Amino acid sequence: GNIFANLFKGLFGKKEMRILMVGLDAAGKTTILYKLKLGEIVTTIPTIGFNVETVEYKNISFTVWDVGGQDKIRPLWRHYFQNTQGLIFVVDSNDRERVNEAREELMRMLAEDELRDAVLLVFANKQDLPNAMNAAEITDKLGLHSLRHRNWYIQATCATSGDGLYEGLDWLSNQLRNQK
Amino acid sequence: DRKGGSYSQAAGSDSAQS
Amino acid sequence: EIFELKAELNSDKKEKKKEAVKKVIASMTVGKDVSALFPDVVNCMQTDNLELKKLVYLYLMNYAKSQPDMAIMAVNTFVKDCEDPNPLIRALAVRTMGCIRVDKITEYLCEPLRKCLKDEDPYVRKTAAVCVAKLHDINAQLVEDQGFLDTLKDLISDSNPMVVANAVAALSEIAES
Amino acid sequence: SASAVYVLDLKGKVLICRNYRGDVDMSEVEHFMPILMEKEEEGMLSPILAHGGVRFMWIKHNNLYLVATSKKNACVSLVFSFLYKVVQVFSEYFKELEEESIRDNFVIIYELLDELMDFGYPQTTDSKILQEYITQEAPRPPATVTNAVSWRSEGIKYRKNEVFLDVIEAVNLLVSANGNVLRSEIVGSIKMRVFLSGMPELRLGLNDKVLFDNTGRGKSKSVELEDVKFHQCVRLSRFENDRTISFIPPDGEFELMSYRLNTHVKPLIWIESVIEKHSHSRIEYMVKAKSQFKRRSTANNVEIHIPVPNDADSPKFKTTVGSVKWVPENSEIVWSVKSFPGGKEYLMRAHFGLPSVEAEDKEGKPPISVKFEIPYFTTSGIQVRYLKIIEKSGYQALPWVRYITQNGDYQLRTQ
């Protein structure tokens, strides 16, 4: 066989990649997805179903599927586990009461044998009020250092400002793409 | 030609009724 | 067969997705219980192609009573499609919303029905009139709570003779029951 | 108020079904076939079946039974009209009505079924209009359906404006075995094949008896149509006011008006048949055909069907004009004539043997039917006056129409 076509495609870029979106509901996941795809703050209701899109940046077609954290929709996240390569976690630092529930849900989902090659990707959401913590307090509370065989990185993103998403995308690309 | 009666031209209205 | 179809439907190629949808439609028409693959087709639902959306909606309508629990993963797609610029897509979504015999599904569809009640498209008006009648037949109490009687009555006094006739027929059917 | 319209097959297999209300389980279609078999075997078969509290109304298509199940006291006439519209749409979209196309165009079939009717209420019935939104080889729905003019699509452009009309005559004669004609009705048919540019509004004017009487010209030959039914594009108000036939012609062949009135004139063909049937020995066919039509008119493709014996064999034909062929499939002798000039008189003498063994059961006496078709002949005498072709842009139209006289329910009771 010959792989000349593959080399020609890679000379201009052929890899696309994928990504997933999980976390607590009402955490700005829809707004973050809109900012990543379009770049505008559109008003959206609670994600009763789900939103799936693709992101084109750095010659990588990052497919993003926004998924809510509702009680009736939390168990439905297993449907997206099939043919999934990436995953992004949206944290709600302004919701102290739901922090324990989010941690338990992450532990339950993080204990899935199918999701093993996906590295950790946590978005520091709720970066609009002083009640938002730092990038180490949230990581310490979530116990991200205890995730063996998990490549986790903490990135703080503000939905209103749109800053911090580029750093997270670059970190995800570096973790997924191991080329120059 | 065509079976069933040849096509014939038709008018636009009753010219004799104004 | 079933595994190969599921693998094809779980792919990122539209050319194989269309063939898989056609095969699934043929199997159901041939008399094959394809309701076991209903959750698999749920992920491959939000598609830009109009041909596959109709097939997906038909499969969901035909596989709604069989798997009511798995139908909870279709409200978001219907809500998103209820505002499509293309009138045909909106009419198809309105028709599919009323065709789903789900008790917990018509509850969340009231907002799209209210939004489409004042739809400018006469075909959209007829589709909303049909959806309101279907919802009232499914749930008369839900229709009364939504207050769609006033909108249906006001439909007869508007333009679009076809939409007016559809609204009158829906009102007669509601009063018939 | 049918619950679901389905398409079945000759072996009981449902070619395609589409639920609209969901009030009836789809498994009731299985019991339709045994019920039909029992009704046919007991003579109680009817198009509208009834499985308990659910009625299974079905009609016999070319190859499948268009069964439409229902549960409530829905409009049976409305269901029949919807089925007829669906059949017309299928015939327009699919040139053949058989199992070869039912299983070949299901992708567009499902879309057409979904678009045609919703919740038991039909919504789309224009085949041309439906072809602009549903195709087998999608844009927004056309505004013509939303607009008042749903039978004349705007923006149509043609190099020429030629419309081919068709004055189709239907000669139905019911001559009893006693020699008297009981049912002699002639049904007119004004069908035009319009192919023009834009949305022309035809202004039809003919030699009607009522119109001539109203205008005061009730002294010449005017057709007094007992039943006059306009097409969909025909405006009922204009005809009701002063017999004003103003409507927007459709794009293609369509039936604008169809006259229907009784006839008090002599039959165009006088057929006298004789039966010298010996008691299990032989049979005689003293068939004499007299053409009562005008000598200037010729009946092309005349086929006078004469029913021969069911067990008859070894026939001998002694005729004068026209080929005679005995078709065992139809069990009758067709007095086939290529062209029959008016006033012609053809005499035939059939002679065949019969089996010695008598038949166990009777076979009946089917009526004798002819298949005469003489074009360019107007027996009713109704003459078209004018056709007001008006366009907003303005163009010179060249309408065309042909008058065809054929044989309809022209059956002759046997002796």
Ligand SMILES: Nc1nc2c(ncn2[C@@H]2O[C@H](COP(=O)(O)OP(=O)(O)OP(=O)(O)O)[C@@H](O)[C@H]2O)c(=O)[nH]1
């Ligand atoms: N004030 C403020 N609120 C924010 C900001 N980012 C996210 N939110 C809140 O987060 C909520 C989530 O909105 P969306 O992103 O549209 O929806 P979602 O994150 O997918 O949540 P669900 O739809 O319920 O799954 C919004 O209602 C906002 O109130 C922000 O930057 N500033």
Ligand SMILES: [Mg+2]
């Ligand atoms: Mg959301």
